[PDB]
């Protein structure tokens, strides 16, 4: 169960 690497400060995902 993976997750997501989304990040609402720069509006942008890193990796996953």
């Not at 993976?2 to 609402?8: K, L, Q, S, V």
Request: net charge positive; hydrophobic share 25%; with cysteine.
């Amino acid at each position: 169960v993976p997750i997501i690497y989304c990040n609402r400060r720069t509006x942008k995902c890193k990796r996953f």
